[PDB]
Paper text:
By soaking [name] crystals with either the donor substrate UDP-GlcNAc or the acceptor substrate LacNAc, we were able to obtain [name] structures ([name]_UDPGlcNAc and [name]_LacNAc) in the substrate-bound states. The acceptor substrate LacNAc (Galβ1-4GlcNAc) is bound to the top of the cleft and more solvent exposed. The Gal ring for the anticipated glycosidic bond formation reaction is located close to the center of the cleft, whereas the GlcNAc ring is close to the solvent. The hydroxyls of the Gal ring are engaged in direct hydrogen bond interactions with the side chains of His282 and Asp333 and water-mediated hydrogen bond interaction with the side chain of Tyr300. The Gal ring is also stacked against the side chain of Tyr289. In contrast, the GlcNAc ring is only involved in a water-mediated hydrogen bond with the main chain oxygen of Gly280 through one of its hydroxyls. And superposition of the [name]_UDPGlcNAc and [name]_LacNAc structures shows that the acceptor substrate LacNAc binds right above the donor substrate UDP-GlcNAc in the substrate-binding cleft. The hydroxyl group on C3 of the Gal in the acceptor substrate points to the C1 of the GlcNAc in the donor substrate at a distance of 3.7 Å. The Asp333, which is 2.7 Å from the hydroxyl group on C3 of Gal in the acceptor substrate LacNAc, serves as the active site base and abstracts the proton from this hydroxyl group. Ala279 from the β5-β6 loop is less than 4 Å from the acetyl group of the GlcNAc of the acceptor substrate.
β1,3-N-acetylglucosaminyltransferases (B3GNTs) are Golgi-resident glycosyltransferases involved in the biosynthesis of poly-N-acetyl-lactosamine chains. They catalyze the addition of the N-acetylglucosamine to the N-acetyl-lactosamine repeat as a key step of the chain elongation process. Among the characterized B3GNTs, [name] is the major poly-N-acetyl-lactosamine synthase, and deletion of its coding gene dramatically reduced the cell surface poly-N-acetyl-lactosamine and led to hypersensitive and hyperresponsive immunocytes. The luminal domain of [name] comprises an N-terminal helical domain (Pro55–Cys125) and a C-terminal catalytic domain (Cys138–Cys397) as well as an extended linker (Arg126–Lys137) that connects the helical domain to the catalytic domain.
Residue numbers in the entry: 55 to 76, 89 to 397
Write the structure that this text describes.
């Protein structure tokens, strides 16, 4: 394949699959992979995020700076894992106060972690470390690893989180992974999980699943991917705004990540890992990752049969949550 990622992924496949039979690590090589400047045509004219992605692609052994090791001391029914960024204090607090509160109704334990990388001063981020410690001490729901938290490193956020599940929360029945700007009807998710047979629950993976997508080739677009980096279609994948899957599948996904090179778009990467597992993510109508009709955004009854809606501001998540608590009496 002319495209770099495809070409390197095929090499991964043959080293994991003897049937294809007829040398730096791809997992813990953390010096720059200088070969990429020779083999990627036009490397020097690529945007900086692509250069950094290609150079350090073979490094994923980053450590936890802030951990909450007893977060799953009690076997959770549902683990909420919310991708966030250091400066988003308001987003995390609104989630804490609304749909992301930890609870134990009916002995079905819901626990919450926020997933962060570093926002270092060398990348011109303002220094908010003392406030992050303060937040972490008080609320004990911050997981932070020491990699550069960037758009193109969100696959790392995925792999490192899945590594944390296998080491520190392997008994959770279900996992919800989402962004910090979505509203999530946590009651409706609990009801949905309790209506699942165990056969169906075993390999559960549902979201707003996208079929037959391809890399955007427009150089101005957020999700632009040049032809020299990737070719072909994307596998089916749930939009990263939020998806829901079993803890048993989380263990299997973690194991399979070693066999899939990181990809700059994190929700495609999870789709690549599912496909390698022989699984197809399941589209569920309750995931509105492109939001609902504006006429309906007003009426709280519009949110009752929803799993999640993107996107909502901190104030709106709290307001929707408060109205939702009395939704059974007027809908
Ligand atoms: C995902 O997250 C990971 C982890 O945080 C990021 O990986 C880091 O990427 C940064 C670059 O953004 C790396 O830092 C760079 O290292 C280069 C090479 O350093 C080695 O070689 C020099 C010389 O041989 C040695 O002195 C050095 O000690 C190392 O042995 C530097 O050349 C880089 O630039 C430096 O000089 C330039 C001048 O052009 C200055 O502008 C810079 O500020 C800097 O001083 C830079 O230091 C870092 O090593 C990576 N960390 C790890 C653990 O691998 C990914 O970048 C990130 N991915 C995305 C897409 O964001
Ligand atoms: C079939 C098709 O092309 N559908 C597109 C979606 O791919 C696209 O979704 C976004 O895609 C990027 C990767 O390119 C990233 O995964 C985002 O999370 C995901 O939302 C959507 C918006 O570009 O449009 C659909 O038409
Ligand atoms: C990953 O492991 C290698 C080999 O043990 C080591 O050289 C490297 O520093 C590690 N990377 C990080 C980010 O710790
Ligand atoms: C919940 O668990 C407690 C043990 O802590 C048990 O005594 C109780 O019967 C359980 N209640 C329900 C409704 O499951």
């Amino acid at each position: 394949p002319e495209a770099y990622w495809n070409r390197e992924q095929e090499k991964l496949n043959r080293q994991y699959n003897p049937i294809l039979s007829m040398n730096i690590s791809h997992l813990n090589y953390c010096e720059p992979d200088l070969r990429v400047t020779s083999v990627v045509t036009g490397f020097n004219n690529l945007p900086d995020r692509f250069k950094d992605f290609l150079l350090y692609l073979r490094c994923r052994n980053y450590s936890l700076l802030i951990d909450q090791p007893d977060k799953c001391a009690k076997k959770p029914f549902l683990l909420l894992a919310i991708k966030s960024l250091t400066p988003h204090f308001a987003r995390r607090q609104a989630i804490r106060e609304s749909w992301g509160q930890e609870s134990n109704a009916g002995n079905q334990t819901v626990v919450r972690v926020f997933l962060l990388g570093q926002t270092p001063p060398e990348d011109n981020h303002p220094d908010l470390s003392d406030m992050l410690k303060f937040e972490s001490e008080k609320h004990q729901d911050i997981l932070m690893w020491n990699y550069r938290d960037t758009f193109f490193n969100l696959s790392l956020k995925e792999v490192l989180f899945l590594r944390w599940v296998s080491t520190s929360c392997p008994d959770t029945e279900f996992v919800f992974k989402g962004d910090d700007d979505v509203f999530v009807n946590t009651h409706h998710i609990l009801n949905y999980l309790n209506s699942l047979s165990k056969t169906k629950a075993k390999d559960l993976f549902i979201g707003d699943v996208i079929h037959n997508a391809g890399p955007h080739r427009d150089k101005k677009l957020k999700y632009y991917i040049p032809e020299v980096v990737y070719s072909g279609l994307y596998p089916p994948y749930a939009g990263g705004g939020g998806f829901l899957y079993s803890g048993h599948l989380a263990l299997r996904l973690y194991h399979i990540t070693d066999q899939v090179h990181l990809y700059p778009i994190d929700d495609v990467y999870t789709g690549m890992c599912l496909q390698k597992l022989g699984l197809v993510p399941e589209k569920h109508k309750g995931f509105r990752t492109f939001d609902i009709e504006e006429k309906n955004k007003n009426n709280i009854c519009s949110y009752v049969d929803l799993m999640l809606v993107h996107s909502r501001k901190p104030q709106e998540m709290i307001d929707i949550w408060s109205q939702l608590q009395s939704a059974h009496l007027k809908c």
